[PDB]
Amino acid sequence: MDKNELVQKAKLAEQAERYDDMAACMKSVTEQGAELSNEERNLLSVAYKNVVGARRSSWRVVSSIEQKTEEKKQQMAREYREKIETELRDICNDVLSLLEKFLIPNASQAESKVFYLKMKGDYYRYLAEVAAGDDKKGIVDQSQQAYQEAFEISKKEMQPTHPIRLGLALNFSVFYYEILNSPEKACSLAKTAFDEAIAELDTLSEESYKDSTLIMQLLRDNLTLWTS
Template sequence: MKGLLFCSAGVWGLTAYFFFYFQNVVGARRSSWRVISSIEQKTEGSEKKQQMAKEYREKVEKELRDICLDVLNLLDKYLIPKAGNPESKVFYLKMKGDYYRYLAEVASGEDRTVVVEKSQQSYQEAFDIAKDKMQPTHPIRLGLALNFSVFYYEILNAPDKACQLAKQVSVADSGQKAYSEALEIAKAQLSTTHPVRLGLALNYSVFFYEISSSPDRACQLAKQAFDDAIAELDTLNEDSYKDSTLIMQLLRDNLTLWTSDTGADDQEGGEQTGETGGN
């Protein structure tokens, strides 16, 4: 599932592109893995079909592991050591926790034990910095609290600890008000193709999907922003063309993935997980 996307000054630019790209790539494979695993469990009566599903699942698992290891290598070698402020440091450490968690989702035995421990260590380090350096309503701190709670609930099977962390996201109403006010200003002052306006719509739609659990509003907002930008695509100037079209692609990718996830959830009895950034 897509994670919450932050376009603040500390993490925008090439770093944000890096984050967006890998979240899309890994998100598609996590979604595929969930669907394939469900199919594999339902084909127990047919050895041939079960073997086919198993082989495809293992292929997706390898791709997912390779992507996660690439991201973790970049984080450890370049991004975390060079983080120049608490916001960036927390953002990168949260990403590290997220990608180790993705590995834990498909790992087993001793391998799983190792990646679970590394995920928890990364989240905890980020959380300690966030509590000391960030306001409780800061979107990166909120996203971290939500993802860390998902880790406790899904990976460690510790619902009490998960609920304790998730309570910190109860202040999300303040976040929604801020997004709403910012979007109104953007609509009044920026063109539909402006990258800042598109980035805001992208973040706000993920906020609705992940934090407010409002997939209909999320899809409506993302689709409206995409359609409005498409209608004025010929007005884009060269300076903002790359940024705007990238965010438009992300809006469309989110819509596609959310629709896919909703279909898979319906087939599996409506199960839904919530996370940010990482999804």
């Protein structure tokens, strides 16, 4: 099928709340090799965010039950967490490898580079949420490095209020808080991203202001939550 048909299919699936369909469309659009338009890019992101999101959320629930059941009830919770975990790693590995094979090497401008480098940061972070063993330190460093290169590219080439730069600070700050356990570096990173944007609320445009202000709100709420 042709890219534009697949896109319209993805939008039907989205409207129907059938995100696995949605991801399968956008995955196959990506596999055609062409650079993604940015409506398309957003579609890929939404599909995959909702598909891992359901697992992340089941994983968390079954994880809590597993650790709060000291019998053979624990054996059953463990096996179910693991089965959930392995679906979740399959979802991240899929996005991760779409990002290595198509999306990052095709990115022509800073904006897209930051977008995908961020996504690569995120999907590594979802894998880190869930990793045990020697696995962990590698996954984490992957995530950190993807964020870091994205961060550097946005401080040099995007405005302080660009939604995609703001979003990257928000998620990079979350990585520092949640994964690395460095609340102090997470706060400083979020606080500067909020302050630099709030001093240029001029300069937002019509296509971006709802997103940029909503992210600024979350930077602040996180700030509030982490200073408690």
